[PDB]
Amino acid sequence: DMYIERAGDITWEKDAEVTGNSPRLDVALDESGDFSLVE
Amino acid sequence: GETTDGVYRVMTRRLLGSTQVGVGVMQEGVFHTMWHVTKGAALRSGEGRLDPYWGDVKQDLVSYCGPWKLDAAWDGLSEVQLLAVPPGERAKNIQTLPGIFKTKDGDIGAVALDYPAGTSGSPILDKCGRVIGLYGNGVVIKNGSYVSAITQGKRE
Ligand SMILES: Cc1cnn2c1CNCC2
Ligand SMILES: Cc1cnn2c1CNCC2
């Protein structure tokens, strides 16, 4: 049995930690909703 | 149950202890999550029941109590924030500049941030606090890093 619990408000936070790169990738999406890399 | 707008954890007591299987967004009385988090099953909020209303395995999205309400879109230029809600940990904002998933049907923003699978369904936001999609449907790239699409539904 699945249940939900509140975790917070949805807001933009000034001076949040900034990380992560921005890759441009060719991908395919199959009938099962799974992505795969196209090469 | 609780119907206040905001971000929620999706939990199960079927496995050992209480396990976080995902996250979701409550907005305008509709609960929004990724299909793979619930597999379309009913949810509980206290003593209240949330029944699935719309879903699609290919988009990997599902709404409860009403139709999909989130329609904001990434502008294709600006940094966004993932409001990550990891299992057993406090909600935390992470700012990033999305990359792009290029597909035969068009381009989609993507966020190169790696969190445990039970973080799936966490919202990605723009600078006005609008939900531009949900985190958790993605791929593993060449160097072994995980990258998630910014998955958004359609408001009918
Ligand atoms: C992580 C996970 C599990 N099942 N699915 C996914 C993502 N793509 C849709 C199906
Ligand atoms: C957010 C999510 C969903 N599935 N997975 C992840 C990250 N680690 C790889 C598997």
Side-chain angles (χ1 to χ4, degrees), chain A residues 6-26:
Chain A
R6 205 173 184 269
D9 286 4
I10 298 168
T11 65
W12 178 271
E13 297 291 347
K14 289 179 199 80
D15 300 311
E17 171 206 347
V18 188
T19 199
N21 76 306
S22 320
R24 290 184 194 254
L25 306 155
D26 289 346

Side-chain angles (χ1 to χ4, degrees), chain B residues 3-153:
Chain B
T3 349
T4 314
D5 279 11
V7 69
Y8 285 70
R9 300 177 194 274
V10 180
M11 309 292 299
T12 183
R13 277 171 188 132
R14 182 183 63 105
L15 272 21
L16 183 76
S18 293
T19 305
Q20 182 177 314
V21 295
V23 178
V25 175
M26 187 79 71
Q27 178 170 134
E28 298 169 60
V30 176
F31 189 64
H32 306 76
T33 189
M34 306 212 80
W35 191 92
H36 78 262
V37 168
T38 66
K39 316 294 186 207
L43 302 174
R44 174 167 52 83
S45 184
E47 264 191 329
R49 189 181 163 126
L50 305 201
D51 297 320
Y53 182 102
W54 168 80
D56 186 291
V57 159
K58 188 174 174 179
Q59 296 184 46
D60 194 30
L61 294 175
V62 60
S63 66
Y64 286 82
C65 311
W68 188 270
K69 302 284 184 176
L70 318 176
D71 55 355
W74 179 45
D75 65 6
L77 285 185
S78 321
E79 288 196 341
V80 303
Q81 286 183 356
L82 168 64
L83 175 39
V85 181
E89 303 177 353
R90 201 138 52 231
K92 173 184 50 138
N93 295 67
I94 311 295
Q95 186 161 319
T96 194
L97 178 75
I100 310 296
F101 270 9
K102 304 177 184 188
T103 86
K104 65 199 229 313
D105 296 315
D107 294 5
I108 314 170
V111 296
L113 297 171
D114 193 359
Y115 280 94
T119 316
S120 290
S122 294
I124 298 158
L125 330 176
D126 62 23
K127 300 177 196 166
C128 311
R130 292 179 298 162
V131 177
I132 56 168
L134 308 184
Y135 169 83
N137 193 22
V139 73
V140 171
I141 70 165
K142 258 186 76 93
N143 60 192
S145 172
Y146 176 77
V147 177
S148 171
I150 298 180
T151 299
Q152 185 54 293

